[PDB]
Copies of this chain bind each other. A is one copy, B any other.
Amino acid sequence: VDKMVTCIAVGLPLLLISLAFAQEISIGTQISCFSPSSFSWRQAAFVDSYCWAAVQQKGNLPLWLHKFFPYILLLFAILLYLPPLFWRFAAAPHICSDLKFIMEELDKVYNIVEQYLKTKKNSNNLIIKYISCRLLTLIIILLACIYLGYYFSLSSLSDEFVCSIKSGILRNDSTVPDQFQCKLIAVGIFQLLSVINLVVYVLLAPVVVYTLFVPFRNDLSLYNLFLEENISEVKSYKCLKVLE
């Protein structure tokens, strides 16, 4: 119930990037500048190479984002991978054996543990590790959500821009016409990828805060709720009840 959130919050940005690259290769380069009819095949591939590199040199913040939208979406994916990567390396040895301990000792009682819960309750160290692995996960969803909302928010006739190559010794020339109407290509594919990654991230925002309500769902309030999720040995206690 909690591993499924951190697999569709990471796997879904990975799926859209791989689908974007099969669309990126099957059409061509992400820029396409309208070179004049006088240029050759190589000079017309110079302008598509210059203008794709010169979107950063001087709003300008809309144009800079379209180049790196697969990268920022990638960085927001591996940064959701690290709280589960740190959960398996910090709080996994402290939880694997102690669930095995209660799983074996409850067999011999029906064939101590009542004073186990009285002293494991007052320990505010492992519930703090649990919420900080999910509160950091919650805000990094919303930072990814506000970026995905901002990228869709522009949505304008903004992929079209005007660049020029007359910078170096090409300045003060008589062949280049000083203006090149370029246009980014993959914007419309990215605008739809910025929506279906936003609606999912909005629909998972009540679910991730539903895990932050473990009394309604101290350390006993954490520990009593984990035993019926990944441990099938509690299901034999219902076999005690159904016979009577």
Instruction: Please give the number of chain A residues whose Cβ is less than 8 angstroms from any Cβ of chain B in the complex.
Output: 78
CA distance A46 to B183 in the complex (A): 9
Contact B29–A27 (Cβ < 8 Å) = yes
| Complex contacts, A185 vs chain B, CB 8 Å | 49, 52-53
A1-B89, A89-B1, A168-B181 in contact; A232/B187 too (CB < 8 A)?
Answer: no
Which of B26, B34, B90 is the one whose CB lies under 8 Å from A24? B26
* Interface segment out of the listed A35-43, A124-132, A134-142, A212-220: A35-43
CA distance A79 to B101 in the complex (A): 40
CA distance A38 to B35 in the complex (A): 13
Contact A68–B168 (Cβ < 8 Å) = no
| Complex contacts, A183 vs chain B, CB 8 Å | 49-50, 53, 168
For residue A116, which residue of chain B has the nearest CB?
B242
Contact B27–A52 (Cβ < 8 Å) = yes
Which of B28, B34, B45 is the one whose CB lies under 8 Å from A43? B34
CA distance A57 to B192 in the complex (A): 13
A142: shortest Cβ distance to chain B, in Å? 21
Which of B26, B29, B40 is the one whose CB lies under 8 Å from A39? B40
CA distance A239 to B1 in the complex (A): 30
Asked whether any CB of chain B lies closer than 8 Å to the CB of A226, the reply is: no
24 A-B pairs with C-beta separation under 8 A: A1-B90, A4-B89, A19-B74, A21-B22, A27-B49, A28-B45, A28-B49, A32-B50, A34-B165, A35-B46, A37-B40, A40-B41, A49-B183, A49-B185, A50-B183, A52-B185, A53-B159, A53-B185, A53-B188, A55-B188, A93-B235, A120-B242, A157-B168, A162-B168
- Report which A residues bind B (CB closer than 8 A): 1, 3-4, 19, 21-22, 24-29, 32-35, 37-46, 48-50, 52-53, 55-57, 67-68, 71, 74-75, 85-86, 89-90, 93-94, 96-98, 101, 112, 115-116, 119-120, 157, 159-160, 162, 165, 167-170, 175, 179, 181, 183, 185, 187-188, 192, 196, 232, 235-236, 239, 242-243
